[PDB]
Amino acid sequence: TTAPKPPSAFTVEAQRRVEAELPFADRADFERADRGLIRRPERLLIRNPDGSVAWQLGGYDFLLDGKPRDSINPSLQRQALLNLKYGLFEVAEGIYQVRGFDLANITFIRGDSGWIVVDTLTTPATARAAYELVSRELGERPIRTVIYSHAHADHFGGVRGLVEPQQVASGAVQIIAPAGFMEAAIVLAGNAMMRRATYQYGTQLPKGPQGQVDMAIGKGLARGPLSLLAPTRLIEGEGEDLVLDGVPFTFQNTPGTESPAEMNIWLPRQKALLMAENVVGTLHNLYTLRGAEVRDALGWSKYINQALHRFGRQAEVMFAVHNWPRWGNAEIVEVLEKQRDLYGYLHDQTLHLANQGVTIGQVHNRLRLPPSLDQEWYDRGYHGSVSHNARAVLNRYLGYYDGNPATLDPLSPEDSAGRYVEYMGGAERLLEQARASYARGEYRWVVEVVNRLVFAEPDNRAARELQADALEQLGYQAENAGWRNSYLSAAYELRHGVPRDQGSADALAAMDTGLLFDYLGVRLDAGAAEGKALSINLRLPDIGENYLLELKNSHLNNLRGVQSEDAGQTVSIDRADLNRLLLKEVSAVRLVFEGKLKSSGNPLLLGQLFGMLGDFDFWFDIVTPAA
Amino acid sequence: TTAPKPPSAFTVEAQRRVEAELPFADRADFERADRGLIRRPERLLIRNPDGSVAWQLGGYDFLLDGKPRDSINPSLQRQALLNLKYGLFEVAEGIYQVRGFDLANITFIRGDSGWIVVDTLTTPATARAAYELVSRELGERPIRTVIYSHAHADHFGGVRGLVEPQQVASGAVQIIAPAGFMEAAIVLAGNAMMRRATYQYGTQLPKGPQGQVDMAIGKGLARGPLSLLAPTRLIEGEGEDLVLDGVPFTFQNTPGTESPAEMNIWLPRQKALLMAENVVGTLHNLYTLRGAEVRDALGWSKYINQALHRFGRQAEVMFAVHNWPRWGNAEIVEVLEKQRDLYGYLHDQTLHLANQGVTIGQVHNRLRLPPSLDQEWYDRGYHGSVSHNARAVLNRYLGYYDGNPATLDPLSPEDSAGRYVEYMGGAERLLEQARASYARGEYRWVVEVVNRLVFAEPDNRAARELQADALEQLGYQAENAGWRNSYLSAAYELRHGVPRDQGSADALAAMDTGLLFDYLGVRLDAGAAEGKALSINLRLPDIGENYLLELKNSHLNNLRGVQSEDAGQTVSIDRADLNRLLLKEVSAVRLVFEGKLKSSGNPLLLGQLFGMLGDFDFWFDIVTPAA
Numbered sequence A, B: 001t002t003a004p005k006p007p008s009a010f011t012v013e014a015q016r017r018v019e020a021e022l023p024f025a026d027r028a029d030f031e032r033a034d035r036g037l038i039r040r041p042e043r044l045l046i047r048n049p050d051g052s053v054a055w056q057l058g059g060y061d062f063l064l065d066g067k068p069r070d071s072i073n074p075s076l077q078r079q080a081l082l083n084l085k086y087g088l089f090e091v092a093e094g095i096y097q098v099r100g101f102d103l104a105n106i107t108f109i110r111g112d113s114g115w116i117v118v119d120t121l122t123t124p125a126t127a128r129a130a131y132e133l134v135s136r137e138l139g140e141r142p143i144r145t146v147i148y149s150h151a152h153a154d155h156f157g158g159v160r161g162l163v164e165p166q167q168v169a170s171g172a173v174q175i176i177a178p179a180g181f182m183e184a185a186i187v188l189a190g191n192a193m194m195r196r197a198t199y200q201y202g203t204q205l206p207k208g209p210q211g212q213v214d215m216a217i218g219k220g221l222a223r224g225p226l227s228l229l230a231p232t233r234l235i236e237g238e239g240e241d242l243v244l245d246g247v248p249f250t251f252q253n254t255p256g257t258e259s260p261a262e263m264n265i266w267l268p269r270q271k272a273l274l275m276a277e278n279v280v281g282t283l284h285n286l287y288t289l290r291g292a293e294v295r296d297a298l299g300w301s302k303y304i305n306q307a308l309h310r311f312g313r314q315a316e317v318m319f320a321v322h323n324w325p326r327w328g329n330a331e332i333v334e335v336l337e338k339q340r341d342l343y344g345y346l347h348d349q350t351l352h353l354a355n356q357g358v359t360i361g362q363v364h365n366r367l368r369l370p371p372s373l374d375q376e377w378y379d380r381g382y383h384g385s386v387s388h389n390a391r392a393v394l395n396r397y398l399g400y401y402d403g404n405p406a407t408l409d410p411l412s413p414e415d416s417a418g419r420y421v422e423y424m425g426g427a428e429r430l431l432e433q434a435r436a437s438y439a440r441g442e443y444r445w446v447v448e449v450v451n452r453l454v455f456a457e458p459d460n461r462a463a464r465e466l467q468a469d470a471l472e473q474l475g476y477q478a479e480n481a482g483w484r485n486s487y488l489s490a491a492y493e494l495r496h497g498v499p500r501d502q503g504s505a506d507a508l509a510a511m512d513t514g515l516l517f518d519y520l521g522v523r524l525d526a527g528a529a530e531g532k533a534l535s536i537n538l539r540l541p542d543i544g545e546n547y548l549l550e551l552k553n554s555h556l557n558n559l560r561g562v563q564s565e566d567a568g569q570t571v572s573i574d575r576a577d578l579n580r581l582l583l584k585e586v587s588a589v590r591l592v593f594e595g596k597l598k599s600s601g602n603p604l605l606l607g608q609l610f611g612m613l614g615d616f617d618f619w620f621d622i623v624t625p626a627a
């Protein structure tokens, strides 16, 4: 059978254990998440210009009765309900947030003549909807300044919902960002990350008790066009004190924590501390499972300590770009200390263990937070997990290899699987044993062993169905939203298979030219490039950049600021026009006839290079070997 | 039986295949490695001041007959003999190198009044011995300048063998380094890295056909005290043109390639290009298996391209801090192009594959260099490997997790092993099957499956002996020196068990104070720190630094430039005296009585904190679960 199964007796027991272990009696977050509520719109339904739906919350109604469901980890269910506390809120005098209109929050700070806005959600429609709610309740005011707290799409993505380029061009609107913002906002492993993200975000799952229920730092991500307008002003060095529209702001740069470009904000008049995405209502990711570079827990901890000693000590309210605020100086001091020691403990104790010989394959089964950190709701592994972050720290310092040469040169899973199956007496015998293990509630073992059979025999329905059943129990048990979604998406694909039916101008415009060509080098089909050699001078006059492109030894090189008198072709095109070509907004033929694409030398080389560029299928297999 | 076994028939066949696949007819390296030889001392034996032996080459005599040995990959054997071409060499007019006195080379450049020296080997005794050979053959000359090509111990370690602090202090000797040198020269995962390095370096193996034979970039690493004298001058930005003792030097910074602080050197008078450790006689590591952060192949490739377009185009000789030079402009241009496209192809094609859904557990079995790159001796995987570097690139962008939730929350190997064994019919049945697989030459499979049995039953001699036999065949087959050494060290420990019998003042002095306390936080025993809280102001007047130390929530924090009026204790000590304490060169009691260690507040806190500090056993288990 191919439909979700009820929670097993072992899964039920695991949920009861969560309740026994975690401080459910501490319900203060429920008060915090409702404090200062101005308006919760009755229903929320946000639409995109093309008619698609950007965001809606009606799919979460099953959570509203607040009744426990054993197919959901009760800690995650608690977070799931708190994230449904959406609408317009007062944080402090003249500081408001619209929460639950998208994954992130959007913050409106009262200036003398308009709003200073912090962040802009993921897509213009959600941002626009938030601004409309603000105007209905507080009165319409022009937005004078938009500040990006950091370089992530759930924060800069909806900017065109608030302001337009002509406002920025005229100086009516300023955009403030931490130094390094443009370099960090925008690729090379994009298809792999996006496809792996369908698991983490559970994009194929229904919203419900046996599907997606929450995304930890918010309900989920709004769907729509991605916008991005470049900053007009950057916060340099350690930070800067600015006055915006009569309001004093202190910006504290925290480079290389949750994002390479990030800054906390202190508002001294309100004694309000906006902790960007450094401190949120959950342990955050040191490693995002969809795939990204490992983050620096050591710096993350130190920057939280820096904020504590500078501001925390005088703060009356602390708030963030995800989740809800926390009021009271003693509460804020403790949250800052604990979040600082959370990242610090994860870092320090992973390394303490590693230095004792505990490997990347063992550390998550050994490392446990001490009670003082374990027993706070904002330290729970909803977004990041202690388990995956400990392995992340270890991977950052020691790498993927566990040091045991048995594992140094491993056969691909699909190549060793047939032998595992044979050694275990064949598929039927393996299933018999795995089913007995399943009946004992040993899901973490079952998913490892039955995965071998699925890889040996991807058309073995019985194997896929058992693997799916065990993964699903693990998803029900998961406190982590990303783990849950991944387990349930894996079950879904094992049961149903992968779909057989299957661009942002601003994002492309933000991409450095060198990175664009690095990406084109990634698209290069090695088979097509084999034995070829060509050099092309590329000139981009609007941005005043020159690149030397060299294809040789089945590799595309690009080099900024150099030209070769020996290149076989010289090509001139504005970066703006190159952008349009890639976005299919203009044809190369029309550009050549307009005199916008120019060439000397052999007119064919760039075309020949383009013809070697391959493509990537989005729906590649994950839970089985490639079809 | 517990002694090395002969190469199997499959291993022999694998060696013959290497010969069929690789260009052994290309023997030009043999001429290159002998070119400009001035003196090869008859025997080489270098001793340390305490009487220990730093370096000797007599253990490699078995290689001298040049006869093929099937327990050594013939490509590695070729490299092993070329690395035995040691002694004093002329590279170009007034440019000499002493090769094979240590892992790295040391370079002497004739100035008007003395030597400009590039790098200093690993330990003073080897450096001193190299200088003595130089003086015997070319005449004794003062060393006026020492340049560190980059921030690695096999390059700055022997500096005290050449110069002393009073020479630097008086300005008689200058030390030049790339900007960032001191930050990159010096920890947190040190015990784990060092212990894992016993495998990579094969520190327990004899020198011989069934032991250690070479270390790729050199024969091995000299053993002795580690020295380091701080630079007096840093090469800033992209680089700088300097004149040293009448000789013109162009320094090209290449930050974040083989080392975070590295610079190539162009010598325009001799048209000589010293490629630091960017281009050597082998594919280098993107990931060193002993464990370290993943290196940036993209930047590595671009920096090689930058050197090519700036200098390569006019170079007559190219040489490096490891291995031998290559003469002739056409040869140099090709080597630079190929090394550039080597790192570029590894990067680009790993990502091309990953974007198609190929995982970190599959990529090394899919990625292959094109013939133009595969068929050059300096592109062979002696130091780095295509296999481990491809997985490294993938790990850098996507992380350790393959995206399949079967693998998201894995049981530790020792906890799932008992079940693998049971499912496979028990130990005897598993061995029976594994022995048949062994008889078919399926070593990569045998080491994966028998490893399960060793982990289930670490005292099962029969299992350990088979695992050892299979690993050993893999070590014999390995072209990579680190892989070979690791496979043979694993066999050694399985057969014999781990030893049951078991500081650099300069290195400690080079360590930032914050990093020192970060390291102390890593030593913190969480059990001992539980429930404790303390704050200590630490003042270090000689360096003018203040730190706030806070222990809370089982985590030690240190914060530069802040002090707390609420700290329970204030401690004052020069960093120089703190160094001496840690090195056991002075007792804390003697320092307090000398007035060199001062305290206000509760005199006990720092002592209490120190008492919570744990230690790490060096010889932790790798190939079995912890004893």
Ligand SMILES: CCCCCCCCCCS(=O)(=O)O
Pocket (backbone or CB within 6 Å): A122, A152, A153, A154, A221, A226, A258, A285, A287, A288
């Ligand atoms: C349209 C893309 C939206 C991107 C929103 C996700 C934020 C990226 C950072 C990953 S993490 O969630 O901080 O761990």
Ligand SMILES: CCCCCCCCCCS(=O)(=O)O
Pocket (backbone or CB within 6 Å): B122, B152, B153, B154, B221, B226, B258, B285, B287, B288
């Ligand atoms: C006494 C320690 C000697 C360190 C020498 C090894 C160099 C460190 C860098 C690793 S790698 O060999 O570049 O990949």
Ligand SMILES: [Zn+2]
Pocket (backbone or CB within 6 Å): A150, A152, A258, A259, A277
């Ligand atoms: Zn973010």
Ligand SMILES: [Zn+2]
Pocket (backbone or CB within 6 Å): A104, A152, A154, A155, A277, A321, A322
């Ligand atoms: Zn965010």
Ligand SMILES: [Zn+2]
Pocket (backbone or CB within 6 Å): B150, B152, B258, B259, B277
């Ligand atoms: Zn090095």
Ligand SMILES: [Zn+2]
Pocket (backbone or CB within 6 Å): B104, B152, B154, B155, B277, B321, B322
């Ligand atoms: Zn080196």
